[PDB]
Amino acid sequence: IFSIFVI
Amino acid sequence: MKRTFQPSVLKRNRSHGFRARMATKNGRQVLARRRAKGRARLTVSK
Amino acid sequence: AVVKCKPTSPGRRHVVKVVNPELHKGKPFAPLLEKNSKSGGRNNNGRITTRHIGGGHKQAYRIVDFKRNKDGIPAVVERLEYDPNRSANIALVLYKDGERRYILAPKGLKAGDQIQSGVDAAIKPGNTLPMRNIPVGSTVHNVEMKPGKGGQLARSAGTYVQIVARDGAYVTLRLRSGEMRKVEADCRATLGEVGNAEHMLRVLGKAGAARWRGVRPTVRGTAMNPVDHPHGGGEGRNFGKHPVTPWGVQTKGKKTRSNKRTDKFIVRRRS
RNA sequence: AGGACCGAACCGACUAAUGUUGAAAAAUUAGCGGAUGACUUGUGGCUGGGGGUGAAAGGCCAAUCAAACCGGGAGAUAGCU
RNA sequence: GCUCGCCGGAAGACCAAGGGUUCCUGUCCAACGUUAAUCGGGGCAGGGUGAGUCGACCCCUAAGGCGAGGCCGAAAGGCGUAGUCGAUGGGAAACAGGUUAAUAUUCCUGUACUUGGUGUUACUGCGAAGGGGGGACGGAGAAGGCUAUGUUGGCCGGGCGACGGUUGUCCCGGUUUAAGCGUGUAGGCUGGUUUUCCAGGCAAAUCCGGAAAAUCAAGGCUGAGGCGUGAUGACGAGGCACUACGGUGCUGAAGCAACAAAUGCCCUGCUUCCAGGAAAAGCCUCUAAGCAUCAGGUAACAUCAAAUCGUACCCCAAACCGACACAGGUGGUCAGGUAGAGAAUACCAAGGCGCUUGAGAGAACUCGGGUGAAGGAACUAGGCAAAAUGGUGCCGUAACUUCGGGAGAAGGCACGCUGAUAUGUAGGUGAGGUCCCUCGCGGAUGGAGCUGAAAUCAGUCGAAGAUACCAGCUGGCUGCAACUGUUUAUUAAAAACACAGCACUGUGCAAACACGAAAGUGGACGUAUACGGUGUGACGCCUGCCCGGUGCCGGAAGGUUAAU
RNA sequence: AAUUCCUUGUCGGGUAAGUUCCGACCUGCACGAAUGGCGUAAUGAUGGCCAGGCUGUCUCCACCCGAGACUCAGUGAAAUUGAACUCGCUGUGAAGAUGCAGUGUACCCGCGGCAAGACGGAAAGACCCCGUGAACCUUUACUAUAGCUUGACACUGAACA
RNA sequence: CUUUAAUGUUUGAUGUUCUAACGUUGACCCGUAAUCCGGGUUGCGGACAGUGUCUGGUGGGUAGUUUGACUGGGGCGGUC
Ligand SMILES: CC[C@H]1OC(=O)[C@H](C)[C@@H](O[C@H]2C[C@@](C)(OC)[C@@H](O)[C@H](C)O2)[C@H](C)[C@@H](O[C@@H]2O[C@H](C)C[C@H](N(C)C)[C@H]2O)[C@](C)(O)C[C@@H](C)C(=O)[C@H](C)[C@@H](O)[C@]1(C)O
Fold first, then answer.
1. Ligand 1 within 6 A of A7 CB?
2. Which domain holds residue B10?
3. Phi/psi of residue C266, each to 5°?
4. Quick one: fold of C195-271?
5. Closest residue (by CA) to atom 34 of ligand 1?
6. Bases along strand D below 7 A from a protein CB
């Protein structure tokens, strides 16, 4: 693829 | 870092040993299954 | 003597201790001790069943005679002691037959005074008596509820009960709670107010003071997610629920007394 | 005297760089916080799965957690690939 | 083997936990070893763990577990009494030295001790699953006394110097010694002894407890260490031999004093404070039933018994938890010199290591360090990172302040070495000699010898004297949170949580409330100055209006309304 | 303003120059009194702003000492991979071409370097939607239900009014 | 073979009294050296309390589920 990104 | 297995025989036997296993209807069924399965170590004891 | 503390550190700045100089410095009367051992607020099921309980100092149990049977024989109060198990102070006693016991410690206390129990016994602070035999209006502390049972009313520091009337085989008492409860009259009831009183005025002053009285932190309803407790989530404070206990019953006014077995005895409820 | 001060052991984990097929499935180095207390530690005990525990993050309950793991119903059902 | 380098509050040493032959010796090098390997914690074979005293077993119990009957539950089962188990705590006793390739407080030499059985000889009221005593207990602080331990001198043995000097005020080394037994000290605690009486200690008690008198006051426990003995013993620098060059034998000097000195011991003491500090047995004493010539009890000597199981090795690690011979994690014990406040830090000792690929090159780049002209935050989201500050004494220090603080605010000055004051002073320690005496480990006086800071004056070297290591950067304005604390183990440490303080509200005790089909348990061996719940969050000044909605409290009327 | 959209509001201060900061105003899009208001000494690995010192942070990078990188010897991995005889350009084309058209260029093969392309490798998207999908959470959604609470009958009787 | 009213009943509502079911987490006794249980005596409470079946209320405390499609992405709007 984670979910980390752108978006 | 400190990992999950911190060995200690006292606790081992008290928690998983033959007698402990034996002290409960289900603990006994534990053995029963292992015997029927023909297991060579019913419960890893001395 | 209540005493402020000088701010030689925050968390002393606000402290206010009660120092009782006339309290026995030194060890308590050995053969009236039994171990107490802490509860951690936990059941015989291991399940926390009263929250916020844990740690605190060790505490040996002083016995304490609540019943007060030694009628006739008189005793002398050797000394005043601190008791960790309560707000009040206790007085080591010594009856003339050579026997020692633990009484509470009514406002007068003071070493050398003379105590006695029974239907005879001087109307005077510290002497126990069936309320059958205490003059209406007295200020009687630790009071029995069932005659011979023990003494269960007004035992906390500075508390007291006021006998206001006594028709039939019954007495009506004025409990500190302000309730008006009838009681069997044949009940023992030691005379006067109970001590310390000043107990009220301490200020504790810091977090630790609480912890080391065995009190654990209280975590607010609305500081937790929906699954934990009926209160809050909210993306920022938020409430919007009638307040309730973590099991859903409302706090803020809902009475929750249901007895009937003992309603006969309550004359007038508090306010 | 002190949840007092500076500071090793001990307990922590604020910054950075390194490391990212590591020396290591979270560390190393240089700095950093606490350091007589709500401190820290060895041994042993109790709490069990919509249950525990939670100074409260949905945190933790054996490298697993908005419902642990093992076996079972079991070839669940899948108008989808 | 000789150098060199690294740790030395460990990277040395002893264990517990855990492992489970990794120990020692021969032998082999395929596989295991991140390379080679003649080597190994690897293969094969053989060897090795010796106890009345260490530890387990054992007696004793904490948490907690189990639990005859019992209470409860559709079954399974739950809880719990009597009990019975459970150490992380209590409980009798051995030390110095030697020896094995490999164990040793276990074997050997010397010298001890503990508890029972039996016997002899004296002398005696013995006797409980029972009473009482004891065991038996917190935190902080303060010194005194003392040991370990160190330093110097003396003593002993050896040295006369690869290079100018070294017959001396010179160099090197050693100078160690236990339990036990005797003594009972510094010092801690406590008034003893007799007679009588008594509603307490479930019965009993001569014990404990309480009340009277009576008479001497010095009695009694407790107690580090020292001293004597143990000991003509042991160990021992160093010597001489031989060695299959790893080692192995033999012999053997002095072995005193002064000063310093712990975080150890006296001390489970002492002083003080609030948060008020396990249990039970062993032990002592008391008697009941019971036994009275007996049996038992006490002492001296003699003798006999003390089984069984563990004991190798690693143990901050290559032997344990980490899949690895893994830069991680792992509790307890010991702790030398120089400088130092120090268990920091730097260099060393004892001892232990150089980390299981190396050899050369001296590119870019990357990692880790060192220095830099002039400039000095222009960098950048941001001084990120670096750089700087850094010790001790004295002088000196603003707003503000809850009167403590702010403060190490800020900022100054001195600092080495030599001589003198003073051939070594102020101080510390303290032997002789003389007097005193309940004669002792006493005391008074006594001042040798030893030890020895800091100051000032004078002088002197360097660019520099807190010279290395180590070792705060400082100040101004402002948001938030009172503060110490807690948190997302592994992208969030914060303004979040907690907190003391505040308020509302519930709860009369078989409390409310919680776990629980129930029995029961927690709340609490508490009782409204208590307890639960909820919100708020030190402190200061304060907290206004609205009860229509929703909720809660009260409301014996009436309307509507369930089973029946 | 931890609340202000309009907003870099406006005025004052600091700077050569300040969307931040400090002080004010009040037009509070949309503060406000225990889901506390306004203050506050002290504390803080807390947020924002400033200054002295300091400097390789920067102008702008130079040299040096060590560990790799390079060479020899020994041991010896990895992800990925339809198959490869695996160039540039302009164009075509399931629409961004090493592989099609046209054309330009290029003897065969290493080693050290660098990352523009192979819509590079790695995880069957989480965002987006979809399924008569899942789960947890909410409530005056629906239907039930433990709990609490109400009465009737039973256990349960006698008197006198 | 009665409404203006009252003596014997079978029967509700309310109020007093009683003890004898039932409660007792008062006291004492025995099993028994035993804070469990039981028996016993007794005081207190007393046809209440509590419990079973039935029953109206309350009931996110807990559970299972539902919460449309079209749509020039989806939502909102609109439409059916
Ligand atoms: C250290 C070791 C890990 O590396 C990191 O975590 C880096 C730093 C992640 O970036 C981190 C950091 C960052 C910034 O990605 C660059 C963040 O956006 C992502 C979500 O996670 C990467 C790359 C993520 O990929 C990215 O995931 C995105 C969904 C899409 C993106 N893609 C389109 C190109 C893709 O490469 C992702 C999923 O972890 C890769 C998958 C296969 C993995 O799980 C593998 C095992 C990784 O965990 C890892 C290599 O072991």
1. no
2. 1-46
3. -90, 120
4. Ribosomal protein L2; domain 3 (4.10.950)
5. A5
6. 1-4, 26-27, 37-39, 43-48, 52-58, 62-63, 66-67
